[PDB]
Amino acid sequence: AAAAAANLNAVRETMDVLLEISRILNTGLDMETLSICVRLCEQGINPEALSSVIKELRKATEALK
Amino acid sequence: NLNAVRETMDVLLEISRILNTGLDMETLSICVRLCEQGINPEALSSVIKELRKATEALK
Amino acid sequence: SITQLFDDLCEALLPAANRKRAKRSLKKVAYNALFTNLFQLPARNKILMLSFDLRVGGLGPKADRLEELVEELEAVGSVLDLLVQLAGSGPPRDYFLNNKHVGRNVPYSGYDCDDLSVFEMDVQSLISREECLCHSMIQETLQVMEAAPGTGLPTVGL
Amino acid sequence: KSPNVLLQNLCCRILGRSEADVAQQFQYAVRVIGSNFAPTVERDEFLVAEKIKKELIRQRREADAALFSELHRKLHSQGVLKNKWSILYLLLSLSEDPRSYATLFAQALPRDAHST
Amino acid sequence: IRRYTDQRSLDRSFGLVGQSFCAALHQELREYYRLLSVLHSQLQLT
């Protein structure tokens, strides 16, 4: 409807806020990847697992650099 | 080849048994041979699922 | 040959003790649905996707068993794409979880007390099998105690 | 999405290489994230806010530590998200300097005083 | 076990291996209290 498009507006705002929080703490991830991480955090997830994966996939291209 | 294909059939029996498929040994070997011909798997998935409803109304 | 491979599929999945015209009519449906489809990402990854859904529901070593068996199963890829579609549809003890008094090289982690209450549900399941059985003995006769003459009995039909 | 393929989406995000070009890293991730996916900890965006402050104070930008305080106000103003803890704790986990001790700093309960 | 440690912490002539020994008996009281905490949460059993 219109009020169902206003929910998506309140998500597009909220994501802009999450992107600002991402940049003032300085990650090396951009908006496209960050949205996938937001998908993951919606189901509820532990970063003690996730951070190792990110620092590994950034370590899997030093030999393909 | 023949010992290795015996081993790969055995491993293929185990992973479909703990996933608790309704199929058995013989129908696994049939389906394996049907896919070994080059027959589309997407069509065999229909005939197994419609047989496994339609055979019970008979009994 | 292939006109028999759907018929042998039809015989093995049909049990026994009409049903003598039905086999020959159901291979007709087997061909009639073969050519409805024909007119109109690796294989191992789907197995990795089902093992992940094992791990979320507990049972870790089982998912590790699935993957150690598909790593040797790489040596069939057209069978697994069929297998993943019949892995959801079905038919219509160990002492080393909480023991440290064995071995000599045995872990120290101390207590658990996070699923030791779900170590008593381990016993609740066993008593819940043997209490559902005594519920399935009292109903199959309580359907008999209230009945009427010859409503399910064809002996009055003679 | 469905959580199994959603990992592969991340794996294809960072390296653009296909999911048929490597299968061990992807297997390593289905090894690591599963059995560590559902929390076994008690959640607190409060405690994580109070260390996000402690991180941005450690970079000695006090206005940005007050800018996060407004962005966190906006986050509650919408109310389109349920688990507001997780993503902030994630972005905190990936913290990095653009330009000690931690066991004597507050961490959450590992469910050793609460079990169902 | 608690009564012993109650007086050894006033004592000082107990070396510093003894005050490492008895210091690695604090964790072992803690874990008891952890067990009891778990039991207290589930009380409201038998």
Swiss-Prot record, chain A:
Compartment annotation: Cytoplasm, Cytoskeleton, Microtubule organizing center, Centrosome; Cytoplasm, Cytoskeleton, Spindle
Source superkingdom: Eukaryota
Main localization of the protein described in the UniProt heading: cytoplasm
GO cellular component terms attached to this protein's record: centrosome; cytosol; gamma-tubulin ring complex; interphase microtubule organizing center; spindle
The entry's keywords: Acetylation, Cytoplasm, Cytoskeleton
One example of a Gene Ontology biological process annotation: mitotic spindle assembly
Family recorded in the similarity comment: Belongs to the MOZART1 family.
Entry function: Required for the recruitment and the assembly of the gamma-tubulin ring complex (gTuRC) at the centrosome. The gTuRC regulates the minus-end nucleation of alpha-beta tubulin heterodimers that grow into microtubule protafilaments, a critical step in centrosome duplication and spindle formation.
Quaternary organization: Associates with the gamma-tubulin ring complex (gTuRC) consisting of TUBGCP2, TUBGCP3, TUBGCP4, TUBGCP5 and TUBGCP6 and gamma-tubulin TUBG1 or TUBG2; within the complex, interacts with TUBGCP3 and TUBGCP6 to form a luminal bridge with actin that stabilizes the initial structure during complex assembly. Interacts with TUBG1.
Stated name of the protein: Mitotic-spindle organizing protein 1
Biological source species: Homo sapiens
Native organism taxonomy: Eukaryota, Metazoa, Chordata, Craniata, Vertebrata
Complete-protein stretch covered: 11 to 75 of 82
Curated annotation (Swiss-Prot), chain C:
Subcellular location(s) per record: Cytoplasm, Cytoskeleton, Microtubule organizing center, Centrosome
Top-level lineage group: Eukaryota
Subunit structure and binding partners: Component of the gamma-tubulin ring complex (gTuRC) consisting of TUBGCP2, TUBGCP3, TUBGCP4, TUBGCP5 and TUBGCP6 and gamma-tubulin TUBG1 or TUBG2. TUBGCP2, TUBGCP3, TUBGCP4, TUBGCP5 and TUBGCP6 assemble in a 5:5:2:1:1 stoichiometry; each is associated with a gamma-tubulin, thereby arranging 14 gamma-tubulins in a helical manner. Gamma-tubulin at the first position is blocked by TUBGCP3 at the last position, allowing 13 protafilaments to grow into a microtubule.
Disease: Microcephaly and chorioretinopathy, autosomal recessive, 1: A syndrome characterized by microcephaly, cognitive impairment, underdeveloped retina and choroid, and epilepsy in some patients. The more anterior parts of the retina, near the periphery and pars plana, have a grayish hue and diminutive vasculature similar to retinopathy of prematurity. Visual impairment becomes evident during the first year of life.
Family listed: Belongs to the TUBGCP family.
Function summary: Component of the gamma-tubulin ring complex (gTuRC) which mediates microtubule nucleation. The gTuRC regulates the minus-end nucleation of alpha-beta tubulin heterodimers that grow into microtubule protafilaments, a critical step in centrosome duplication and spindle formation.
Protein name from the UniProt record: Gamma-tubulin complex component 6
Species name: Homo sapiens
Lineage: Eukaryota, Metazoa, Chordata, Craniata, Vertebrata
Swiss-Prot record, chain E:
Protein localization: Cytoplasm, Cytoskeleton, Microtubule organizing center, Centrosome
Disulfide feature: none
Tissue/organ expression: Ubiquitously expressed.
Residues annotated as transmembrane: none
Annotated family: Belongs to the TUBGCP family.
Function, as annotated: Component of the gamma-tubulin ring complex (gTuRC) which mediates microtubule nucleation. The gTuRC regulates the minus-end nucleation of alpha-beta tubulin heterodimers that grow into microtubule protafilaments, a critical step in centrosome duplication and spindle formation.
The protein's assembly and partners: Component of the gamma-tubulin ring complex (gTuRC) consisting of TUBGCP2, TUBGCP3, TUBGCP4, TUBGCP5 and TUBGCP6 and gamma-tubulin TUBG1 or TUBG2. TUBGCP2, TUBGCP3, TUBGCP4, TUBGCP5 and TUBGCP6 assemble in a 5:5:2:1:1 stoichiometry; each is associated with a gamma-tubulin, thereby arranging 14 gamma-tubulins in a helical manner. Gamma-tubulin at the first position is blocked by TUBGCP3 at the last position, allowing 13 protafilaments to grow into a microtubule.
Listed name of the protein: Gamma-tubulin complex component 3
Organism: Homo sapiens
Gene name of the record: TUBGCP3
Parent-protein start and end of this portion: 304 to 363 of 907
